[PDB]
């Protein structure tokens, strides 16, 4: 408890925050796990760091629009890697080869209640997964959304500018270029988003009738 504390000395610049990333995208460092909170949409949407004054150089932006797509795709397999994540922990649950190290009984006589309310609740906790998948894909979407914009922007730059030193006719092939590889990987990206709404969220709802209705609800499991 001091009134008088430490100096802010030492920031971490803007320019180094987006390096790192870039050091992470580009060579796929960006692990899975951690490619969340990392969107190049940040500086694309607003352009402060990747402007030069009051144009941007399409240098910046075909470097960050091609880096965007890397890692905008990784982020969705990003999705898809926690869902695998969330079937192993399913699978795990269901495997019985495994002899019986401990059987829970013991002293018999143990008067077990009927079906106490906490049992669905425990699935509650299942819901909050299954909307943070949602959530989740519903970024990436949104980000999608947000780069399409952007593009949009820097094509009324290439618009205005005839190509003096930005880099207009570089731009334009470059944004095709990335826009192919982002519809190339947007049939995985729609896939991953089909089969969430086709198996995952179904997934609850089996979950529901495998472990709680099947051993929980109905007597004699």
Same mark, same amino acid.
């Given at each position: 408890?001091?009134?008088?504390?430490?100096?802010?000395?030492?920031?971490?610049?803007?320019?180094?925050?987006?390096?790192?990333?870039?050091?992470?995208?580009?060579?796929?460092?960006?692990?899975?796990?951690?490619?969340?909170?990392?969107?190049?949409?940040?500086?694309?949407?607003?352009?402060?760091?990747?402007?030069?004054?009051?144009?941007?150089?399409?240098?910046?932006?075909?470097?960050?629009?091609?880096?965007?797509?890397?890692?905008?795709?990784?982020?969705?397999?990003?999705? +898809?890697?926690?869902?695998? @994540? *969330?079937?192993?922990?399913?699978?795990?649950? &269901? #495997?019985?080869?495994?002899?019986?190290? !401990?059987?829970?009984?013991?002293?018999?006589?143990?008067?077990?209640?009927?079906?106490?309310?906490?049992?669905?609740?425990?699935?509650?906790?299942?819901?909050?997964?299954?909307?943070?998948?949602?959530?989740?894909?519903?970024?990436?979407?949104?980000?999608?959304?947000?780069?399409?914009?952007?593009?949009?922007?820097?094509?009324?730059?290439?618009?205005?500018?005839?190509?003096?030193?930005?880099?207009?006719?570089?731009?334009?092939?470059?944004?095709?270029?990335?826009?192919?590889?982002? +519809?190339?990987?947007?049939? @995985? *990206?729609?896939?991953?988003?089909?089969?969430? &709404? #086709?198996?995952?969220?179904?997934?609850? !709802?089996?979950?529901?009738?495998?472990?709680?209705?099947?051993?929980?609800?109905?007597?004699?499991?």
């Amino acid at each position: 408890g001091h009134m008088r504390a430490v100096t802010p000395m030492k920031r971490v610049p803007i320019l180094a925050n987006f390096e790192e990333w870039m050091k992470m995208a580009t060579d796929n460092k960006i692990n899975a796990a951690n490619s969340w909170n990392f969107a190049l949409i940040d500086y694309f949407h607003d352009m402060s760091l990747l402007k030069e004054g009051d144009s941007v150089n399409f240098q910046k932006a075909s470097c960050t629009l091609d880096g965007c797509v890397k890692i905008y795709t990784s982020r969705v397999d990003s999705v +898809a890697t926690e869902t695998g @994540k *969330l079937l192993s922990g399913l699978a795990d649950s &269901r #495997d019985s080869k495994k002899k019986d190290r !401990e059987d829970g009984g013991g002293s018999g006589g143990s008067l077990r209640k009927k079906i106490n309310p906490k049992v669905m609740n425990m699935i509650d906790s299942v819901e909050k997964k299954e909307m943070s998948l949602k959530h989740m894909m519903k970024t990436v979407l949104k980000d999608k959304h947000k780069i399409e914009e952007t593009i949009a922007t820097l094509d009324e730059y290439k618009r205005k500018a005839s190509g003096g030193s930005a880099g207009t006719r570089m731009f334009e092939d470059r944004k095709e270029k990335a826009l192919k590889t982002m +519809a190339k990987k947007d049939l @995985k *990206l729609q896939e991953i988003t089909e089969l969430l &709404r #086709d198996e995952i969220e179904p997934k609850l !709802e089996k979950l529901r009738q495998e472990k709680r209705a099947f051993l929980d609800f109905q007597q004699t499991q």
